[PDB]
Amino acid sequence: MQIKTKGDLVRAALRKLGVASDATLTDVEPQSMQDAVDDLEAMMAEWYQDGKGIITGYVFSDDENPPAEGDDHGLRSSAVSAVFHNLACRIAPDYALEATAKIIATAKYGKELLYKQTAISRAKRAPYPSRMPTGSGNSFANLNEWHYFPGEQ
């Protein structure tokens, strides 16, 4: 994928913003990288919300390793194009730059695609209520004295 490391995400976001790339002759300054990776960790910690949020493969650094830029991230190949686009949309307030509308639309699309699979997987129907008889057609649960549904428990 060639975007294995968090530093790759930061560099891609900066290049998208036009701050530091090779298409523009400027280079990345380390403190910008540190600020961007801190902001990326903060943003990613808000989306997951301990599980009740957007579920994506991501490893949060325990800070045992001091340099958090070089370590790997567990993002699946489909979420990368959303994560760094959202990161680039968020970073621009740090400078006076404003993100282009294309980046905003791409971030919207990426987040929607991120959450759609979990939305499909989490749409489950509730069981039968406790006071609902099972009709005389079952003929086995009816013979086992188990006339009524157990309930939501």
Partner: protein, 147 residues
């Protein structure tokens, strides 16, 4: 009472902490160079010597590592890393971000005053210290005094 005072209890190890915050530089690097120059390039760097527990010096490479506590680590915590002259300090962070840069720094070593005192003063054994004259002359070097 008022007994003589010679040495005070003190901490002999320095801590390097990040400016603008109260955190310790995790695994930064310290570059030591000449007075008003850039310590990064090889030309401006100056020799750096360890000071062991016993009087001895071992030279090491210029970039100095820092552990999580903020003290220079080497393998185990290293003692006083004494250099010569007045150097310029250029502390970098873990990911190559400049923490602080200072031009002129000079702090003298408080240890080993015996060697400096021996190299400083001149010898006069006197006579009151010794009972007789022969033993006084035996230990007399480049001078002698009478009662």
């Amino acid at each position: 009472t008022d007994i003589t005072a010679n040495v005070v209890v003190s901490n002999p190890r320095p801590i390097f902490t990040e400016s603008r915050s109260f955190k310790a530089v995790a695994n930064g690097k310290i570059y030591i160079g000449q007075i008003d120059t850039d310590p990064v390039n090889p030309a401006n760097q100056i020799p750096v010597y360890i000071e062991n527990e016993d009087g001895s010096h071992v030279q090491i490479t210029q970039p100095l590592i820092i552990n999580a506590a903020g003290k220079i680590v080497y393998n185990g915590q290293l003692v006083k890393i004494v250099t010569v002259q007045g150097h310029s300090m250029a502390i970098y962070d873990a990911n190559g971000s400049q923490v602080d840069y200072i031009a002129n720094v000079l702090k003298y070593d408080p240890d080993q005053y015996s060697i400096e005192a021996d190299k400083k003063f001149k010898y006069s054994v006197k006579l009151s210290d010794y009972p007789t004259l022969q033993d006084a002359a035996s230990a007399a070097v480049d001078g002698l005094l009478i009662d």
